[PDB]
Curated annotation (Swiss-Prot), chain A:
Residues given in the record as ADP binding sites: G27, G79, T80, T81, S82, T147, K148, G396, G467, E468, E482, K487
Listed GO CC annotations: cell body; chaperonin-containing T-complex; cytoskeleton; cytosol; extracellular exosome; microtubule; zona pellucida receptor complex
Binding positions for Mg(2+) per the UniProt entry: D78
Residues that span the membrane, as ranges: none
Family the entry assigns: Belongs to the TCP-1 chaperonin family.
GO molecular function: ATP binding; ATP hydrolysis activity; ATP-dependent protein folding chaperone; protein folding chaperone; RNA binding; unfolded protein binding
Cross-link (Glycyl lysine isopeptide (Lys-Gly) (interchain with G-Cter in SUMO2)): K233, K234, K366
Function field: Component of the chaperonin-containing T-complex (TRiC), a molecular chaperone complex that assists the folding of actin, tubulin and other proteins upon ATP hydrolysis. The TRiC complex mediates the folding of WRAP53/TCAB1, thereby regulating telomere maintenance. As part of the TRiC complex may play a role in the assembly of BBSome, a complex involved in ciliogenesis regulating transports vesicles to the cilia.
Stated name of the protein: T-complex protein 1 subunit gamma
Post-translational modification Phosphotyrosine, affected residues: Y232
Localization per Swiss-Prot or TrEMBL: Cytoplasm
Chain's gene name: CCT3
Modified residue annotations for Phosphoserine: S155, S228, S229, S237
Catalyses which reaction(s): ATP + H2O = ADP + phosphate + H(+)
Curated annotation (Swiss-Prot), chain B:
GO term, biological process aspect, one: positive regulation of protein localization to Cajal body
GO molecular function, one term: ubiquitin protein ligase binding
Organism: Homo sapiens
Binding annotation for Mg(2+): D76
Disease affiliated with this protein: Intellectual developmental disorder with polymicrogyria and seizures: An autosomal dominant neurologic disorder characterized by a broad phenotypic spectrum. Main clinical features are developmental delay of varying severity, intellectual disability, seizures, and polymicrogyria. Additional variable features are non-specific pyramidal or cerebellar signs, and visual impairment.
Protein name per Swiss-Prot or TrEMBL: T-complex protein 1 subunit alpha
Family, per entry: Belongs to the TCP-1 chaperonin family.
C-alpha cells in the first residue's frame, strides 16, 4: 500500500531502476546486463525481455511496467526496452514537480499531446517504405537483424522472413491489416542442408506427427483431421449400456463399428490414405484405420490439425456426420512424409485459404537452424510491422530530437502548464541520444546540444545520432530504420504506461 | 481503545475513505488494489474497489456495505457515503471528545439529515430533457473520450443522449415507453462517422444467411434462436436392408430429407425468419432457403434477444422444444412488420425493420475507425446509463455540487435558528456536506475552499436553481470547481439518489458512534 509521492517517487523507483542498465542494454552498441541467478548463475542480457522475468519485483508499478514490456513483447518483441524506458523516463521529471503544481491530470492530457506531436512529427520523418521491393524492406529488415546480430542467417532468413510474412500476407479482415504471422512458423529439422531454410505454403507438421506408417508419402490421398470421434459410438450417434447379459453384447457392437463405419463410410469417400485423429483416436479406432488401408495417426493433437487446418487449409471436422475433402485435406492435397534427419516430417503443402504458409528452416543442426530461426524473428516481426505499416522512419536522435524540440516548440506553442510535461517528455526523447552515446563512450552533452543544433538547422529530420557510429547523422543516409510501425507502436505503449502509473497516486490492497 | 478505538472507527474509515475520496467515481485516479498480498489490481470507482478491497476493521466493514447498500439502491452517492460517515465522524469527532454526548447532535444531525432533504424535496426538475443530466450533450460528452467524437460530444451527443431520451423504442417484449430498458444501438467502423444514425428496427449483429435465403421478407415471422440449429449425426434411414445399392443412397439420403421435410414443416409450423444466436449449419439453413424462409446466424445475444423480445409471442431464444433436426413447435414465432435485409454502416446485416408487435429503432454509430466505435461505445452505453436513470427518475434535483454549498448554508441557516446544542448539531451537519465538492477538487485538482467557500459565496437567499449559478447556486463541474447553469454543463443529481446517501451517511456513523469499545471482556 502506497500513496502520493510514495507511489509517484516509487513509480520512479519502479521503471527507471528497470530502465537504468537497459539503455546501456539498448541501442546498436547495446551493453548487456550481468545477472546473478538464484543458483549463483549469470545471464548476460541486452534484453529488456529477460531482465524483468528474472529480476524480482522492486515496486508494484514495476509489475505494471513488466506487463507493458510484455505488451510490447506481445505486440512486437522489441521495444520492450524503450516502453519501460520511455514511460519510466517520463516518470522522473514531470510528476512530483507537477504534483507540486498539483496534478497527475494536466500531465496526462500533456502526455496525450506529448504523444500526438510525435505522431504529428512522424508522418514526415516516418515516410512510406515500399513493401513491394524486398530490399526496400530488407534495409529495414537488415536494420532488424543488425543489432541482435546472428550475422550468417541475418542474411538469408531475412529474405526468408521477408517472404515469410509476405507469403503469409493475404490477410483479409476487409481492412487489409497485416498482423499476420502465425501462418509463418519455423520448422525444427534435424540434419539436412544449412540452406533450404525457406518459406513453404501451409504447415509442414514438425510437432507431433511422425510415423513409420503414413506410408512414406501420401500425396493425392487426403490428410484427414478428426476432432470427431473416430472411436465407436454404441448407439446411433450415441452410446448405450455395457454387457451384463448374453442379450446385450451382440446389440452393442453393431452400432459401435457401424458408427466407425458410418463415419468411415463418409470418411473414406473423401480418399485419405492418412487420417490424422487428434480426438477419437484410440486402439480400435486407429486399428480400424490400420484395417481401413488408411494410416492410423496417433500422438497427434489440435495444434497439429489446426496447423494442418493451416497446412492444406482443412477444417478439422466438427461433424460426426458427412466428412468430405474440403473438411480435411483441402484441395488435391499434399501430405509429404520426409525424413530430413531421422524425424518423419509431415509436409502438408497446397494450402487452401492460401497465403497461410509456414517456413521450412533447415540447418545442418538445430543451432545453425535456430540461427535461422532467431534471425527470422526480428525480420519477420518487422516485416509483419512493415507489411502492417508500410512506412519507415530514421532512427536514433532523428525521431528523438525532431519530436524533442517539437514538444518543446509545442510547449512554447502552449507556454502553459502542460508545457512542463512537454518539457519533460521532449527530454525523454533525448535520453536515447544519450543512450546511444552513453554506449559509444563520447560525451553526449557536446552532441546533445549539437543534436539540438542538428535540430537548430535541420530539425533533426533524418539526422539522429547513430549508436554504433556515435555521431549525429542522417538515417536515410545510413538506412537505419525504425518504422512508424515499430516506434509509434513502442512509443504508443509507454505513452499510456507513464499515464497508467501516474494514474496511480495510491497503491492499496 | 475507547476514543482511541472510536477514532480507529473513524480513522480506518478516513483511511480507506481516502481511496474513495482520492478515487472519486470515474474521474478518480486508477488505484492499484492488491487482491490479497502478491496480486495487485489497478482500478478505481470507490463504489467498486471496496469490494475488491478486503476490509480490515469493523469500521470500514459497514462502509463497503453501506456504500454497496447505497450502490444496490442506486449507483451514485456510493463512493461518497463512505467518506460522509467519516466526514460526520470527523464533525462529531472532537464533539464526542469535547463536552458532547453525540446522542444530542446525532439526533440533531438526523433532523439535519431530515431538514436538508426538504430542500432536495423542493429541488427538482420535471423537464431536464433538452437540458439532459450532467448537461445533455455532456451526458455523452462525459461518456465520450473525445478524439474523433469530441466535437461530436455535441453532434452524436445530440444523438445518443437524445436517442434514449427520444427515439421510438421497444422495452422488453415490444414495449413503447421511456426506456429503463436501455436502447439497442450498435457501432460499425467505416464510411463517414457523422453519418452514424438511427435505423428503423433492431440493428443486428448477425451472420447473414442469405445464399438465396430471401433477403426482404414482408410480414416476417421471426425465429430468434439461442438454441442452435446444429446438425445430428444419424444412422441408416428407412429400413436397414440393401438388395440393390441405391437404397444405401436413399437410406442415408433421409438424413437431410427428414429435416428438409421438417424444415418445410417449419414453414408449416412457422416462421418467415430464423435468427440464431447459436449456430445454423447451411445444412439446416439451405432447407430454409429452399423453403423460401429466412435463417440468420449468430445474431448478437443482445441484438437477437432484443429482437426475441420485440418480435413477439414465443421465441427459441428463451425456449427449446426444437432439435433443429426437428420441425418447429411454433415456440419459435416472433413477428416482424417486414424484414428487409439491409445495407447499413459498412455492414450487410439482416435489419429487422420495426416489428409486427412493435416499431423498433436502433442507432448504429459509424466509426471513422474502430476508435469511435471504441469511444462511442461508452458514449453509447454510459449516455445510455445516464438517460435511463433520467427516464427512470424524472424527479431529479437541479445541481449536484452547489447544492451542498447551499445545503450547508441552507441547513446552516436552519442551524442558527433552532437554538441550544441542536443549533450546533445542525451546523456540524452543514459541514460534512461540503466534502463532496471538495473531493471534486481532488480529481479536478481544484482548490477546495476557493471551490467550496466560493460555492457558498453564491446566493441571494439560499437556493440551487438553473436560473442562477451566480446570484444563487446551481450545477458544478468535473471540469472546474465552478457551479454552472445545468444545461451548459451543470452536474444534475437524481433526487432519489441524494436523500439515500443523505439518509445513509448518518446511518453508518451513529451505530459506530454508539459502540464504545471493540475489544474483549
Amino acid at each position: 500500500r502506497e500513496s502520493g509521492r510514495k507511489v509517484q517517487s516509487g513509480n520512479i523507483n519502479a521503471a527507471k531502476t528497470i530502465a537504468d542498465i537497459i539503455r546501456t542494454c539498448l541501442g546498436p552498441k547495446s551493453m548487456m546486463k550481468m545477472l546473478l541467478d538464484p543458483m549463483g548463475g549469470i545471464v548476460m542480457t541486452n534484453d529488456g525481455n529477460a531482465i524483468l522475468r528474472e529480476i524480482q519485483v522492486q515496486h508494484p508499478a514495476a509489475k505494471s511496467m513488466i506487463e507493458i514490456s510484455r505488451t510490447q513483447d506481445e505486440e512486437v518483441g522489441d521495444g520492450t526496452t524503450s516502453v519501460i524506458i520511455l514511460a519510466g523516463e517520463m516518470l522522473s521529471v514531470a510528476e512530483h514537480f507537477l504534483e507540486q503544481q498539483m496534478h497527475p491530470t494536466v500531465v496526462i492530457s500533456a502526455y496525450r499531446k506529448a504523444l500526438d506531436d510525435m505522431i504529428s512529427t512522424l508522418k514526415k520523418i516516418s515516410i512510406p517504405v515500399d513493401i513491394s521491393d524486398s530490399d526496400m524492406m530488407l534495409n529495414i529488415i537488415n536494420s532488424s537483424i543488425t543489432t541482435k546480430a546472428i550475422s550468417r542467417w541475418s542474411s538469408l532468413a531475412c529474405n526468408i522472413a521477408l517472404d515469410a510474412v509476405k507469403m503469409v500476407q493475404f490477410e483479409e479482415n476487409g481492412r487489409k491489416e497485416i498482423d499476420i504471422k502465425k501462418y509463418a512458423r519455423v520448422e525444427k529439422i534435424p540434419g539436412g542442408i544449412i540452406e533450404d531454410s525457406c518459406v513453404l505454403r501451409g504447415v509442414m507438421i514438425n510437432k507431433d506427427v511422425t510415423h513409420p506408417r503414413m506410408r512414406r508419402y501420401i500425396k493425392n490421398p487426403r490428410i484427414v483431421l478428426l476432432d470427431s470421434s473416430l472411436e465407436y459410438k454404441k448407439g446411433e450417434s450415441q452410446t448405450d449400456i455395457e454387457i451384463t447379459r448374453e442379450e446385450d453384447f451382440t446389440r452393442i457392437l453393431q452400432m459401435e463399428e457401424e458408427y466407425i463405419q458410418q463415419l468411415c463410410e463418409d470418411i473414406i469417400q473423401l480418399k485419405p490414405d492418412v487420417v490424422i485423429t487428434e480426438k477419437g483416436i484410440s486402439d480400435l479406432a486407429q486399428h480400424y484405420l490400420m484395417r481401413a488401408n488408411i494410416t492410423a495417426i496417433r500422438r497427434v493433437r489440435k495444434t497439429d490439425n489446426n496447423r494442418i487446418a493451416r497446412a492444406c487449409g482443412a477444417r478439422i471436422v466438427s461433424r460426426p456426420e458427412e466428412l468430405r475433402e474440403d473438411d480435411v485435406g483441402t484441395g488435391a492435397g499434399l501430405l509429404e512424409i520426409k525424413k530430413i534427419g531421422d524425424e518423419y516430417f509431415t509436409f502438408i503443402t497446397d494450402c487452401k485459404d492460401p497465403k497461410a504458409c509456414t517456413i521450412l528452416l533447415r540447418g545442418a543442426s538445430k543451432e545453425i537452424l535456430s540461427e535461422v530461426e532467431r534471425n527470422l524473428q526480428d525480420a519477420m516481426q518487422v516485416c509483419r510491422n512493415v507489411l502492417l505499416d508500410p512506412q519507415l522512419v530514421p532512427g536514433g536522435g532523428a525521431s528523438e530530437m525532431a519530436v524533442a524540440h517539437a514538444l518543446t516548440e509545442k510547449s512554447k506553442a502552449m507556454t502553459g502548464v502542460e508545457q512542463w510535461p512537454y518539457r519533460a517528455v521532449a527530454q525523454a526523447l533525448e535520453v536515447i541520444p544519450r543512450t546511444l552515446i552513453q554506449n559509444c563512450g563520447a560525451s553526449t552533452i557536446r552532441l546533445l546540444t549539437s543534436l539540438r543544433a542538428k535540430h537548430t538547422q535541420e530539425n533533426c529530420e533524418t539526422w539522429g545520432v547513430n549508436g554504433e557510429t556515435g555521431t549525429l547523422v542522417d538515417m536515410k543516409e545510413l538506412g537505419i530504420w525504425e518504422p512508424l510501425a515499430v516506434k509509434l507502436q513502442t512509443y504508443k505503449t509507454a505513452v499510456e504506461t507513464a499515464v497508467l502509473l501516474l494514474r496511480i497516486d495510491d497503491i492499496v490492497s | 481503545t475507547g476514543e482511541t478505538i472510536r477514532s480507529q472507527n473513524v480513522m480506518a474509515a478516513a483511511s480507506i475513505a481516502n481511496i474513495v475520496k482520492s478515487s472519486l467515481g470515474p474521474v478518480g485516479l486508477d488505484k492499484m488494489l492488491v487482491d490479497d498480498i502478491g496480486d495487485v489490481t489497478i482500478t478505481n470507482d470507490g463504489a467498486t474497489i471496496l469490494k475488491l478491497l478486503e476490509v480490515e476493521h469493523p469500521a470500514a466493514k459497514v462502509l463497503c456495505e453501506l456504500a454497496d447498500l447505497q450502490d444496490k439502491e442506486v449507483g451514485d452517492g456510493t463512493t461518497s457515503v463512505v467518506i460522509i460517515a467519516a466526514e460526520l465522524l470527523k464533525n462529531a469527532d472532537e464533539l464526542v471528545k469535547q463536552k458532547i454526548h453525540p446522542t444530542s447532535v446525532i439526533s440533531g444531525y438526523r433532523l439535519a439529515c431530515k431538514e436538508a432533504v426538504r430542500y432536495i424535496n423542493e429541488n427538482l426538475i420535471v423537464n431536464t430533457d433538452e437540458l439532459g443530466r450532467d448537461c445533455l450533450i455532456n451526458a455523452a460528452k462525459t461518456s465520450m473520450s473525445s478524439k474523433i467524437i469530441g466535437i461530436n460530444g455535441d453532434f452524436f451527443a445530440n444523438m445518443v443522449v437524445d436517442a434514449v431520451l427520444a427515439i421510438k423504442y421497444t422495452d422488453i417484449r415490444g414495449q413503447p415507453r421511456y426506456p429503463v430498458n436501455s436502447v439497442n444501438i450498435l457501432k460499425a467502423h467505416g464510411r463517414s462517422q457523422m453519418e452514424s444514425m438511427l435505423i428503423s428496427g433492431y440493428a443486428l449483429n448477425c451472420v447473414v444467411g442469405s445464399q438465396g435465403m430471401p433477403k426482404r421478407i414482408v410480414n416476417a415471422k421471426i425465429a430468434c434462436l439461442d438454441f442452435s440449429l446444429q446438425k445430428t449425426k444419424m444412422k441408416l434411414g428407412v429400413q436397414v436392408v440393401i438388395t440393390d445399392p441405391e437404397k444405401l443412397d436413399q437410406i442415408r439420403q433421409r438424413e437431410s430429407d427428414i429435416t428438409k421435410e421438417r424444415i418445410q414443416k417449419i414453414l408449416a409450423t412457422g416462421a418467415n425468419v430464423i435468427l440464431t444466436t447459436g449456430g445454423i449449419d447451411d445444412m439446416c439453413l439451405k432447407y430454409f432457403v429452399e423453403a423460401g424462409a429466412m435463417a440468420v446466424r449468430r445474431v448478437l445475444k443482445r441484438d437477437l434477444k432484443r429482437i426475441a423480445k420485440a418480435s413477439g409471442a414465443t421465441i427459441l431464444s428463451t425456449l427449446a422444444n426444437l432439435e433443429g433436426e426437428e420441425t418447429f413447435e411454433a415456440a419459435m414465432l416472433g413477428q416482424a412488420e417486414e424484414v428487409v435485409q439491409e445495407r447499413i454502416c459498412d455492414d450487410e446485416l439482416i435489419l429487422i425493420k420495426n416489428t409486427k408487435a412493435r416499431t423498433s429503432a436502433s442507432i448504429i454509430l459509424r466509426g471513422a475507425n474502430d476508435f469511435m466505435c471504441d469511444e462511442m461505445e461508452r458514449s453509447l452505453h454510459d449516455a445510455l446509463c445516464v438517460v435511463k436513470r433520467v427516464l427512470e427518475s424524472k424527479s431529479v434535483v437541479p445541481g449536484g455540487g452547489a447544492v451542498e454549498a447551499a445545503l450547508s448554508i441552507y441547513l446552516e441557516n436552519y442551524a442558527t435558528s433552532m437554538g441550544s446544542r441542536e443549533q450546533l448539531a445542525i451546523a456540524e451537519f452543514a459541514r460534512s456536506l461540503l466534502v463532496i465538492p471538495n473531493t471534486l477538487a481532488v480529481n479536478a485538482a481544484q482548490d477546495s475552499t476557493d471551490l467550496v467557500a466560493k460555492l457558498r459565496a453564491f446566493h441571494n437567499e439560499a437556493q440551487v436553481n438553473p436560473e442562477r449559478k451566480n446570484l444563487k447556486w446551481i450545477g458544478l463541474d468535473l471540469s472546474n470547481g465552478k457551479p454552472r447553469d445545468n444545461k451548459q454543463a451543470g452536474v444534475f443529481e437524481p433526487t432519489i439518489v441524494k436523500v439515500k446517501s443523505l439518509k445513509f451517511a448518518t446511518e453508518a456513523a451513529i451505530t459506530i458512534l454508539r459502540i464504545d469499545d471493540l475489544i474483549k471482556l
